[PDB]
Swiss-Prot record:
Top-level taxon of origin: Bacteria
Stretches assigned to the Globin domain: 1-133
Organism in which the protein naturally occurs: Aquifex aeolicus (strain VF5)
Keyword Methyltransferase part of the UniProt annotation: no
One Pfam family of this chain: Globin
Protein name, as recorded: Uncharacterized globin-like protein aq_211
GO molecular function, one term: oxygen carrier activity
Family to which the UniProt record says this protein belongs: Belongs to the globin family.
Length: 139
């Protein structure tokens, strides 16, 4: 799991994400769809307000990163939505690149924050991928 210092740094970004989260995720999508245009098809026809939905999930993750059992239901819900749109492990570094770049552009929070969010993203990605692997096996 993440170190206490990484957790402390993640918690310190919660106010920034509450103020700027949707700006960050909208920029993430702009970078993702431009650099990796095949990802557009994963989201076509899905629900509205994707930047808001991701920003809320990131804020909740940062808030409960030290209490992840509180996110059991939310993480299960994400995994099921991912499986319905054929999200695969190979996609996760694409969103990571674009999300960390958006965080740097919009918040310019320094290398300590960006390293912490890289670790936090990777932890949640591995969690989701593992759950999704199981769901991909389920009738
Ligand atoms: C740690 C990384 C990620 C997080 C925190 C995350 C978060 C979310 C959330 C909160 C939802 C909406 C769940 C719901 O309300 O039902 C979602 C759905 C979705 N995500 Fe992710 N996601 C991640 C990685 C990815 C990646 C790498 C891709 C593909 C490049 C992706 C593509 C999608 C798609 C296509 C949907 C379905 C949208 C919909 O049904 O409205 N996600 N994800």
């Amino acid at each position: 799991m993440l170190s206490e210092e990484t957790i402390r740094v993640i918690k310190s970004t919660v106010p920034l994400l509450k103020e700027h989260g949707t700006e960050i995720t909208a920029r993430m999508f702009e970078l993702l769809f431009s650099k990796y245009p095949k990802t557009k098809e994963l989201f076509a026809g899905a629900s509205e307000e994707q930047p808001k939905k991701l920003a809320n999930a990131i804020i909740a993750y940062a808030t409960y990163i030290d209490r992840l059992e509180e996110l059991d239901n939310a993480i299960s819900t994400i995994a099921r939505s991912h499986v319905r749109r054929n999200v695969k492990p190979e996609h996760y570094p694409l969103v990571k690149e674009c999300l960390l770049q958006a965080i740097e552009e919009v918040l310019n929070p320094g290398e300590e924050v960006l390293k912490a969010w890289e670790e936090a993203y990777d932890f949640l990605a591995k969690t989701l991928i593992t759950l999704e692997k199981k769901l991909y096996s389920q009738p």
